[PDB]
Amino acid sequence: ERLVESGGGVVQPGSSLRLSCAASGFDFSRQGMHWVRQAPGQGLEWVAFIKYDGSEKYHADSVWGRLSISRDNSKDTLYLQMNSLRVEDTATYFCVREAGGPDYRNGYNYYDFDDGYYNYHYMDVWGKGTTVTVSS
Amino acid sequence: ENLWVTVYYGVPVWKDAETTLFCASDAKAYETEKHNVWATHACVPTDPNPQEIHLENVTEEFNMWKNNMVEQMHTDIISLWDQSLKPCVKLTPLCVTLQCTNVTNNITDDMRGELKNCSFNMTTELRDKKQKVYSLFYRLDVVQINKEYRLINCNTSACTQACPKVSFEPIPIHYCAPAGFAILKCKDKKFNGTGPCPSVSTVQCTHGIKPVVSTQLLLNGSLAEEEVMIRSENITNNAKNILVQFNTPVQINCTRPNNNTRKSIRIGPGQAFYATGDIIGDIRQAHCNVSKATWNETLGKVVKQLRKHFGNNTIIRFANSSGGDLEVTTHSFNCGGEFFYCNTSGLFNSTWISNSNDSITLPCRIKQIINMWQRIGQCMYAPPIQGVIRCVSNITGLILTRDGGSTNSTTETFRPGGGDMRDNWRSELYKYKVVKIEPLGVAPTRCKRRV
Amino acid sequence: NLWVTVYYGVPVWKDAETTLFCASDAKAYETEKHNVWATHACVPTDPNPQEIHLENVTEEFNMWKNNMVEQMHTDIISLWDQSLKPCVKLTPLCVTLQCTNVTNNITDDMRGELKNCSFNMTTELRDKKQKVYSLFYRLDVVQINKEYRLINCNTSACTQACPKVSFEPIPIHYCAPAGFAILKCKDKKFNGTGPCPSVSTVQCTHGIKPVVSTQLLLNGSLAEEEVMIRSENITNNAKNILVQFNTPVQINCTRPNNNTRKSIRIGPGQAFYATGDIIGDIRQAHCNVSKATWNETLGKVVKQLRKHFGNNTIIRFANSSGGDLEVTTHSFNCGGEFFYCNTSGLFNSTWISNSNDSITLPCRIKQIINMWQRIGQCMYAPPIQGVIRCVSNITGLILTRDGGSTNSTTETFRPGGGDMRDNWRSELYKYKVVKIEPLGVAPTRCKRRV
Amino acid sequence: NLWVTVYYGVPVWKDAETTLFCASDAKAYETEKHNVWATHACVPTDPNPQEIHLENVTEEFNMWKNNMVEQMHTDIISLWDQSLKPCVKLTPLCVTLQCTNVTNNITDDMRGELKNCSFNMTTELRDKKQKVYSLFYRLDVVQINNKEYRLINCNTSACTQACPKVSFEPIPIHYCAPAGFAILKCKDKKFNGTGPCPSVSTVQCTHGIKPVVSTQLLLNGSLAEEEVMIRSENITNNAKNILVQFNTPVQINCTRPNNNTRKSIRIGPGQAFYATGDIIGDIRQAHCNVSKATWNETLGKVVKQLRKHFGNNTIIRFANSSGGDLEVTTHSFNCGGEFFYCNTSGLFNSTWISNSNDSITLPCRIKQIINMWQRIGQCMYAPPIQGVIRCVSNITGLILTRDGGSTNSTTETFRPGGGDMRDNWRSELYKYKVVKIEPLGVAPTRCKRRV
Amino acid sequence: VFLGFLGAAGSTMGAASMTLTVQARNLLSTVWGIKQLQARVLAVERYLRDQQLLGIWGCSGKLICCTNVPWNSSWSNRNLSEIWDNMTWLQWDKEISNYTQIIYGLLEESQNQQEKNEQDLLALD
Amino acid sequence: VFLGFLGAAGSTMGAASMTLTVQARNLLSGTVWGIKQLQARVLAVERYLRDQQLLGIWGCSGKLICCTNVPWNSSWSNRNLSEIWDNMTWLQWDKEISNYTQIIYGLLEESQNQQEKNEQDLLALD
Amino acid sequence: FLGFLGAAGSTMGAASMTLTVQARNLLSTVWGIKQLQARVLAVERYLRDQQLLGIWGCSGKLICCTNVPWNSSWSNRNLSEIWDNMTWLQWDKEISNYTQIIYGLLEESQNQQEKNEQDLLALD
Amino acid sequence: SALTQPASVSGSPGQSITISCQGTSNDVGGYESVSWYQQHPGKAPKVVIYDVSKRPSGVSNRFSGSKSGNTASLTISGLQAEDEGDYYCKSLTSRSHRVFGTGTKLTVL
Ligand SMILES: *[C@@H]1O[C@H](CO)[C@@H](O)[C@H](O)[C@H]1NC(C)=O
Ligand SMILES: *[C@@H]1O[C@H](CO)[C@@H](O)[C@H](O)[C@H]1NC(C)=O
Ligand SMILES: *[C@@H]1O[C@H](CO)[C@@H](O)[C@H](O)[C@H]1NC(C)=O
Ligand SMILES: *[C@@H]1O[C@H](CO)[C@@H](O)[C@H](O)[C@H]1NC(C)=O
Ligand SMILES: *[C@@H]1O[C@H](CO)[C@@H](O)[C@H](O)[C@H]1NC(C)=O
């Protein structure tokens, strides 16, 4: 029921950095999380999505093969890794949770693998985020 | 003169009869008591040593094709099989929509599509919730609906998973007659299938008989001495099966190279379903090995004896099964807790005119849902066995059916059979016969009673 | 000088009770039709009876206190439910039914007897529902609040019959075990209780047909040259009165409806055989009895009743007093189809101081029944293809009395069956079981040599 | 000179084991009410059974190595299982429960012991669902993560409910030997469970034995004569339990002041589940009362005879249970169909060195999911019973165990503990023994057969 | 003449004494299966009870046998001729039914004394 | 020496008469394997009683060898006694007299009954 | 009347006059099959004892003697110190081992007497 | 392909306004999964429509949405001062990816 992002800083172009997101007050091992970044005067930009168990990963075409996303349910933390940052890559990244729940059919509730949550295709809670800038 | 009637009690007179023989387990099998499938715990322990008594100057008639001992054995074993399935789980809710896809991790060309990765919605411990689960199923246990698949047994009958704590090892059992009845054993070695037996010896009861179920071959059976015996109800009739016995056994090695891990899935409160989790390493087809040198030498003995009845000029040729269901055209047996159905076309392929590590391999498949007794409505799901399995067996006979028919051809064709499962047990009870004792007898002599 | 002498095997017997085993012919055994009554498990009977005519012996008999009828009632019930275990139990049939009247070729007399219900039903797969329709009689559906439900839903899980087994009664024989004997009375004039001048012993009873019926005895043994009336207390009204016909009367029963069975495939290996559309016209099932013959046997019955009620009183017949459908109707089965016939047209006449009309009786058909008056049990009869036509002959009546408020001028008799125990008394009234006592002592002038 | 003679029917017996049939009194056989221990199929016993004194005989006795208790233990298990077959299975109750603590006039100590649970459940029609509520004890519900709870037995095994028509009242049961066997009774008043019995008598069969179930105490049993006695298989061995039989009984009253009500719920066709509705009046904790004056002097007598095996200068101490499973660390019993789990730490708390209306209150708990046999997969749900209940029982026994790691010390402590159900029943059959008659016998005397 | 089982039920008591052997042969010969098993065992134990009781009296193997016990006149004072010519076994049982138990016990102890008497006589005399 | 159960089966009729006792001991020895096994005990017990009561009513209550007071019809057999006892065995002797077995049993039944009645009258006054 | 098993403490001589009373006691769903097996067991146990007594030529007797000599090794005590002081229960344990070998002696002796009886009357 | 939205929409309080948000038919009209969001400066965006056309709990009932074939729009009745802010439309793509719209600026008179 709360997400905190940390790890911001100033790096030269072509460097690497990692952002950490933490979840508490709710089951981290049942719902997937997203990644969105925004800049002043610019609209929201979706980065990537990861399932509850990380069976498959989805990435945007504009940043295909750029940002690597992984999670660790044991540590109750989320990781966002990017390499060779560009001048235009600066934005305010937010750790966002995708709401989900059991599918109701025939009178019963149908979960996913290892008691997963089927995505309801809307976002409910959003993190405060961290601002990062790139300078040469 | 004036000879009178005298009655004698306990005279040795007998005739054929029918009775319900009882079991007699060994001392070792009566102590472990590890929940055997044949319910040997209720079976009474046997005698410490055999008490065979030889009878001299006696002639008795035997008939292995009308003996009622095999009928009692056949009737009992079905009841023992049914009784062992009641106190364990029933897989009634597994009939659900299945989404099966091929596995292509480390498959072999032989095992191109023999394994399917099936996922389905199964009930959890709570009645109001359903959890997605996955398992690996063989192709023989899934049938396409139109992708979408379903179990073959769903539209015929729902049946019980083979119980995991029970064992299928065929320990020997002894059939014994009650008081007032005796068992006569024919010690003649030339006894084919009927006739007087020069040496008849009465015994306490029968020796250890292993209830091995097999088709087209006899495994772990009894061995003849210094001869190959061929027995048939009517050699002239081609519709009667032919039974063969081997003096020297030939060894067959069967194994499953695949290494799989068992996974337990909870289907309800107090019920568990064991499914194949995943296969570690490469995937290869199971196969059985028979030495070519030994098998070819054994076949030479068979044709020599078989050529006696049909003429010493007749040409003997062998061929595989004529077609039909998988239960009859293939060799069926078990190795541990897994059931095989193997293609023996590579054995019965030869032609005889009558003037060392080849290791003939018989690739074959494995089925999990089996109708062992050829009855519709009572199947069984054998849970997977952890790790690889290996076992060696003794091939001690064959079940051959002649398909000559035409009288215009000199050559004769012999093919494996196995349609009836009583032939496997009849090959071991042919020596024994059941008779009843009548102690009352009257004879005339000179004796009078005082007034 | 008298001394004690012992004899073994003297013909002395005393009344006692024992368990009697079955005895059947080889007719059903050879066919192997798997009847509800297991003749294959039942012991084969003797090739011919071995009755012995005993002389100078008089033995007491009592059908009302006879223990043989108690065992027969228990055994038949035990055999009835033993055959219901294998075949399917219709536990998932309790759903909401949307029923509507049929108005294609319905006659006014059957305007609303059968409905057209449609409901969701399960299949082999536990995640699919199939929409099917079936035709149910009005007696088997009740409005829950259109929405209908079966009467058994709030009672118990409702099991259906096995289609293979047949409900046709077949003769059975009761035999005493070793050391016991059965005595038969051959006196035709012998009423329910009393000494029998002629007594005979048999090892097995004659063939007994376990026909179940109310207010009418069908396919039973007849009397000889007269009509016999038996009752443990003729004065008491609470005790039923049993009548045996010397000459039988034929009754014709039919079901003109031509319904089609539809095997709805539910569950793995289970089957529910529902009733499909009826081709052709739809009419009620009815039974005919000849008026000339029926009126003739009433005249014989009333004469016998005059002996126990005076030769000047008036005998009147009335229909059933009241109750549910089970006791106020002539309940029976006909070729696997159960009937509940309204017999108000028979017992409507008066007799004082004394042309094939073919009296017809409206009848009803029920699917869910309670066979032995129990609660919480079913036997759902599957529908039968074609038209059903069975011909039977009546061999007795069961009647009850009422009133008698010090007015000894008119007597009213009404049908009524308390239970099926009295149904089988008409066949077991001439049989009793005794045990042999071989040991005996008598005085004789004889000693033991020392 | 001397010749052998055979006598048929001499008084000679040998040890043997056999199955004894049931027997019930006339009063208990005419109740016309169903019960767990079937009153039917038990042959009635004649009044005033004959007891035949056997003079000048000594017979070895042993209650620990007795097969009668083993057969009784197996019989009661079969009797218990037979009565739970016709009852209705409670498998649909494995559903999600949303429970809230009930708080109207709850006392402080019992707070949190009752949960007000509302859950969805089925009805007679398969296509409709109904919402019902019931009260469940805290011992019968567990957490999952208006909180969410779940039945404890759902994850182990589902099980039926006790049928209201049958009763758990322990009617007397007589174990009676068949023909050809005899039962020997030891009339000695100083029989310590082993050794010859100078006063040995034979009876037709045993008297009424009540099949009572209890832990750490023996209720409604037989009392010793004029003295308190200590029974043990091995005094030196601390592992073996100690059986104590009181010469005089102490009254114990156990009441449940809550006025529970029964609210029938129809769960399917012909099957109903009995739940608990609103409770009228205040809510109070169940407890049991034992008089302190009688209990204190009872221990004073017990400690004196117990001091014989340890010397009069041995310090004897009493302490409560050592902890563990609830069913073994608490005094478990039933009170008119309601099962109690009482805390006995308030009794065994004292010490003895070189040696009016106040009572003792023992808090007790109530549980419905019951196993009682140390088994897995066979539980039972006792339905609630209307109105308050109070039962008065006797304490005619005690089970204690010894401990101590010191190799040599002057202080010995004892703790209660329920080892096995056989201990509760072996305290009643210690006087009985089953023997087999051997009428055949040979002895020499002057008798030559006539020729 | 042959009359079958219980053929001489109403015949003369003396006449029935010549047909005692026909009755002795007739003493012994899932729902149905269990029911038959009970009857067979019950017949076996019933037959052995009569044989064992007859054995103790010293007439084990004799159909007709008399002991050395006087006949009490209290039980019946009727003439021997009247009993064996104008009476049947069914009526005879009812007349001595009450006194049957007393007669049975006397023969049991009498035989044991007879067995002991002959044992000591042949030892030296 | 010891021949065992059915040891003298092939031996002559006379020699087999000396070993009749060994067969007499074997007449009564002493869920699928449960109730099914119970019928074995009952069948053995009832068979022994049938063979015992049938022999008992012939006057041969407890004698292994016993003779009755009835003649041997010449129609049944006309063979020398030497061949019957010293050459023939009990196995083929049953076949020759199998048809006449039923009738001879009846004659023994009435012969013993006549003895019982005659004995009582003889010792009454003589 | 000491009742059933009432002479277990009496001496061998005194217990010889009460054999009759102990002879009667030989024969007389959970509880169904349990009682059925026990009832059959009593029937066969009684017949086993009678069968052994039958082949000894005196089945229908309670006290019986056979024309076979006694062995002094079995018991050196005289008749006075057996039939007047000790007890049947004590006697069984003293010669328990010899019981099996003795049974064969009577079995062969009785069959010997049958041959003599048939031959003696036939010749004369 | 990013969704196309108008640069700005103006409307006096108490009136009804319509916002257009269009993309590809397969992405929008195919999967039927369409969502709308509202954002304020200094705060993360908040979901305003739970389903494609259903509002979630804890939001005013004045909001309403509809879809017509390929075209979808959001309608607000009874505009108030608090409605000022930034609004965005989000929907799933054909390949199960997330695409954000251009965005529309709302001006309150
Ligand atoms: C899966 O296997 C089936 C039969 O084994 C074959 O027809 C099909 O083409 C296979 N599909 C794939 C994707 O391998
Ligand atoms: C057939 O040939 C074999 C060859 O070994 C010979 O032994 C046999 O006697 C021959 N039989 C006939 C009938 O020629
Ligand atoms: C009653 O009247 C009928 C008339 O036929 C007659 O036969 C009968 O004997 C009469 N009975 C009495 C008791 O008067
Ligand atoms: C019993 O107690 C006394 C003390 O009065 C003591 O002297 C004696 O030794 C004790 N008994 C034993 C066996 O030690
Ligand atoms: C038996 O013997 C009698 C007379 O000795 C004779 O009449 C009769 O024919 C014989 N039986 C047969 C079957 O010949």
Tab-separated table of C-alpha atoms and ligand atoms in Angstrom, chain B residues 101-104 107 112-116 139 149, ligand 1:
chain	number	residue	atom	x	y	z
B	101	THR	CA	1.329	-28.417	-26.253
B	102	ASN	CA	4.348	-30.343	-27.487
B	103	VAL	CA	7.567	-30.435	-25.470
B	104	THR	CA	10.732	-29.606	-27.421
B	107	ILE	CA	13.530	-34.495	-27.509
B	112	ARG	CA	9.026	-36.374	-31.596
B	113	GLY	CA	5.556	-35.842	-30.131
B	114	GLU	CA	5.227	-38.625	-27.576
B	115	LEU	CA	5.004	-36.182	-24.628
B	116	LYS	CA	2.517	-33.335	-24.161
B	139	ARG	CA	0.062	-39.096	-26.060
B	149	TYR	CA	-7.382	-32.233	-25.279
I	1	LIG	C1	2.989	-31.043	-32.198
I	1	LIG	O1	2.908	-32.457	-32.406
I	1	LIG	C2	1.907	-32.848	-33.357
I	1	LIG	C3	1.897	-34.358	-33.382
I	1	LIG	O2	2.952	-34.897	-32.597
I	1	LIG	C4	2.216	-32.230	-34.719
I	1	LIG	O3	1.178	-32.565	-35.633
I	1	LIG	C5	2.334	-30.718	-34.594
I	1	LIG	O4	2.746	-30.158	-35.837
I	1	LIG	C6	3.345	-30.350	-33.512
I	1	LIG	N1	3.407	-28.907	-33.340
I	1	LIG	C7	4.538	-28.254	-33.049
I	1	LIG	C8	4.419	-26.767	-32.907
I	1	LIG	O5	5.607	-28.839	-32.904
